[PDB]
Design a protein around this ligand. Structure first.
Ligand SMILES: Cc1cc2nc3c(=O)[nH]c(=O)nc-3n(C[C@H](O)[C@H](O)[C@H](O)COP(=O)(O)OP(=O)(O)OC[C@H]3O[C@@H](n4cnc5c(N)ncnc54)[C@H](O)[C@@H]3O)c2cc1C
Ligand SMILES: Cc1cc2nc3c(=O)[nH]c(=O)nc-3n(C[C@H](O)[C@H](O)[C@H](O)COP(=O)(O)OP(=O)(O)OC[C@H]3O[C@@H](n4cnc5c(N)ncnc54)[C@H](O)[C@@H]3O)c2cc1C
Ligand SMILES: [Cl-]
Ligand SMILES: [Cl-]
Ligand SMILES: [Cl-]
Ligand SMILES: [Cl-]
Ligand SMILES: [Cl-]
Ligand SMILES: [Cl-]
Ligand SMILES: [Cl-]
Ligand SMILES: [Cl-]
Ligand SMILES: [Cl-]
Ligand SMILES: [Cl-]
Ligand SMILES: [Mg+2]
Ligand SMILES: [Mg+2]
Ligand SMILES: [Mg+2]
Ligand SMILES: [Mg+2]
Ligand SMILES: [Mg+2]
Ligand SMILES: [Mg+2]
Lengths: 451, 448
């Protein structure tokens, strides 16, 4: 009957929760981890992992259809089974569940399958029983928002996309963020007649202009239909087993599926926070200080639920550093949220870190900003007729030309960024790049040979 | 005639130095006896990378497509078309290099130069002089030196191929043999790789040499260690038999070798200068690329330092900045130069090997971080190719003195890490950089 006591209770078994629980357990803490759905959270089950698998498949189909002849190959794709692709993808995710469970076991983590709700400042309830600890981590992540139009029951969010076991012949993606950009490129590369509709002149408005421009340009060249200045009005199911999505501008598209990515919301509703001193912002995100402390001593928060940078490695690092602080005496340790690198898996991929050109100009002024810009055809395309471009930009500030932003779009940029992120975090200048000998022949060398 | 600068060799180093000199107003003469662009453009980095790409594409189609739900058939593979297309691209490069030389007012002569005096050279029976002369003549393949050597092909012979041998034996332990072996193996040839010692790639970190062999063996390449070539004989059925000193013999359609290169200094007329050569024939130079004779300089493969294109280019450019743009103290640092080897999968390396670090700093000052994982790319098929990474750290601060990796995508990962390492990155600098997920590159910043 008495509350079962632990040193640490982690609510949510996703990127942030698993990382924080494991690190606390490694340091000898008696840890309880609570997950209501599936171990691994969003990234493993309906996020980064399945997205990357599908991207890889779509890239493979594109390479085979377009780039093989130039290298002397006459290739025929006798069949493509989207169903088998999905089955293999899900079999890998099941394997990941096992890998994560073995990691948790190695760190002596005890787990509960169910949803937790606070019942006091240091007490939660799940499946009828109460548990208490002096340290509780909220790592509940987020979930998709609804489309909010008539016929939305016919549309699919990202979860709906992953639930697909057959590919639609025609599809309309609604949204301007990286999720819509990535998923649109995936079904398009796999052969669906693909439309991408977004509200303004351009999508990916938070990205550097070079990147938003080029993602659209590259997709448009390969045959994706772009519908800018398109606000959804309604989705109608017709008598012929198909849908018609109409926009406020009057245009319409007949399609087999509508997939939307119009924002996510934090999993703080029905968490019982009224029983704590944890404050939420207007959007429902948990307020935290630099140390991941909520407004109540004894409760912490990391990951998507705090509404800062919604990436798996951020949640992981925030969670690990938090456990080092609480259970390994690293009293002053915290995660720096500046200069976090991001890769977006468009076709080709995008790499970005630091400030956009417009943000740099606003912060430092035109007289203090110098932009280096490069555009070249990767050697990979030298033998075919399709000359896809790779575009790169370095944003430098002051006499010293300190790099405050680096952006690129092109084949292979997904693997080029990590090292440059290290150098930029260290305060790299244009001179530091220039003094590093190039590696030839690679696309990466173009970053250190810009004039 | 008289010029401000005479450049002997129209390869990576010579073109780079000549263009930079012309850009600064020097009257330049560049002499090239063969093809503009030298080794890298014609019979090196460029065609090597093109063939590697074709090889990787075939391996991908045959092995990795089923896992992603594709039933694919390679109906035909035309090595002849691949080479035609490759050479068409190289011809385009010739044109671009020539346009660049024209833009910098470089005069060119097609012929082989020989020194006749300390500041005078001869080409096509005519003499030319200049107060500054750059030797950028590069190197060439060594010969096998055994009976039947004429039946084998060096790397130049490999690029001269317009058709592929069905069965092939690669001879040599260096990166050239390693790369070419992987290329023909991925393109379908029954491939053997024979080298003199227990392992190849002996100048590379042990993790890299060991894994290159392991990865190749797993994919069906036949490895023959402790195999010193003895002879090659042509049989009555128009096939070759290469025999080694250990008694092994292999019947094959071609023997391709990479047993080292030698500097192009022997027919250069250096007896007419004060330019000294080392015991192997390399031109001796100081940190500023000065030969032992004032007025003559040398860059690139001919100096026997780091035989890479970007090194030759940077040495040549900086030399021209020093000689023609008053950058008196400018020189190229040859430490921490990054290298990528296009094996299958590729190899990335910068800094010291584990053994060199241990010898230099001592066991109690060296800490090694290792990572081994299966790239997600391979998660859906039966073949789980591994990616292996190593960070070599020194002292209490764990300064990174070496970084090594083998696996898919490492070819594009290295450049940025080289910048950080050149800046003096520590393990803490890597740890303090947020990872990018999902990528292979994140494993470099998350080792424990
Ligand atoms: C389509 C898509 C693609 C993405 N691609 C990438 C990418 O390529 N790279 C990248 O870095 N990031 C990517 N992300 C973002 C990444 O998935 C998230 O940033 C990350 O999953 C956040 O981790 P988290 O621990 O905050 O939340 P989650 O991983 O969402 O975990 C929260 C967990 O808590 C559980 N939960 C919620 N409430 C309770 C409760 N009361 N009790 C018990 N359990 C609860 C949920 O079931 C969930 O499993 C992507 C996201 C999406 C949607
Ligand atoms: C198979 C192979 C693959 C390679 N792959 C890579 C790689 O991926 N990355 C990399 O960085 N490096 C690579 N290299 C190395 C790179 O090609 C060389 O380091 C680079 O070409 C050296 O440039 P250089 O100017 O010193 O000599 P070269 O490029 O060889 O140029 C020397 C030129 O001088 C000419 N010449 C010689 N003597 C005379 C004379 N007396 N008069 C007139 N002309 C003369 C020759 O015809 C030649 O064109 C590779 C080399 C080979 C053989
Ligand atoms: Cl973990
Ligand atoms: Cl939108
Ligand atoms: Cl911008
Ligand atoms: Cl979204
Ligand atoms: Cl040049
Ligand atoms: Cl050998
Ligand atoms: Cl070697
Ligand atoms: Cl070693
Ligand atoms: Cl060699
Ligand atoms: Cl490979
Ligand atoms: Mg499942
Ligand atoms: Mg709300
Ligand atoms: Mg002139
Ligand atoms: Mg002979
Ligand atoms: Mg075959
Ligand atoms: Mg002669």
């Amino acid at each position: 009957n008495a509350m079962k006591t632990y040193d640490y209770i982690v609510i949510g078994g996703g990127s942030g929760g698993i990382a924080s629980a494991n690190r606390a357990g490694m340091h000898g803490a008696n840890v309880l981890l609570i997950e209501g759905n599936e171990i691994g959270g969003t990234c493993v089950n309906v996020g980064c992992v399945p997205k990357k698998v599908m991207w890889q498949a779509s890239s493979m189909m594109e390479m085979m259809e377009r780039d093989t002849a130039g290298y002397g190959f006459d290739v025929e794709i006798k069949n493509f089974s989207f169903k088998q692709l999905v089955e293999n993808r899900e079999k890998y995710i099941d394997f990941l569940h096992g890998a994560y469970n073995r990691g948790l076991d190695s760190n002596n983590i005890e787990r509960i399958h169910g949803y937790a709700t606070f019942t006091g400042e240091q007490t939660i309830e799940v499946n009828g029983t109460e548990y208490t600890a002096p340290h509780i981590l909220i790592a509940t992540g987020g979930r998709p928002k609804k489309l909010g139009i008539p016929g939305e029951e016919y549309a699919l969010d990202s979860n709906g996309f992953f639930a697909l076991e057959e590919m639609p012949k025609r599809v309309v993606f609604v949204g301007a963020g990286y999720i819509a950009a990535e998923l649109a490129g995936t079904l398009h590369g796999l052969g669906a007649e693909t439309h991408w509709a977004f509200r303004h002149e351009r999508p990916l408005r938070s990205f550097d202009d070079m990147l938003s421009e080029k993602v659209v340009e590259r997709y448009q060249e390969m045959g994706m239909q772009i519908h800018p200045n398109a606000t959804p009005a309604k989705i109608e199911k017709t008598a012929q087993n198909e849908y018609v999505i109409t926009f406020e501008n009057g245009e319409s598209i007949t399609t087999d599926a509508v997939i939307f990515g119009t924002g996510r919301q934090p999993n703080t509703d029905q968490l019982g926070l009224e029983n704590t001193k944890v404050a939420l912002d207007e959007k429902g995100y948990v307020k935290v200080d630099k140390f991941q402390n909520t407004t109540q001593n004894g409760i912490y928060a990391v990951g998507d639920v705090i509404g800062k940078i919604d990436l798996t490695p951020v949640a992981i690092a925030a969670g690990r550093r938090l456990s080092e602080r609480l259970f390994n005496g690293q009293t002053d340790l915290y995660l720096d949220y500046n200069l976090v690198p991001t890769v977006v898996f468009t076709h080709p991929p995008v790499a970005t870190i630091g400030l956009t050109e417009k943000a740099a100009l606003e912060e430092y002024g035109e007289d203090q900003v110098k932009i280096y810009r490069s555009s070249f055809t990767p050697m990979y395309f030298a033998l075919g007729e399709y000359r896809q471009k790779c575009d790169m930009k370095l944003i430098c500030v002051g006499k010293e030309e300190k790099i405050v932003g680096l952006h690129g779009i092109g084949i292979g940029v997904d693997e080029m960024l990590q090292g440059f992120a290290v150098a930029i975090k260290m305060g790299a200048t244009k001179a530091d790049f220039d003094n590093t000998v190039a590696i030839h022949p690679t696309g990466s060398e173009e970053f250190v040979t810009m004039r």
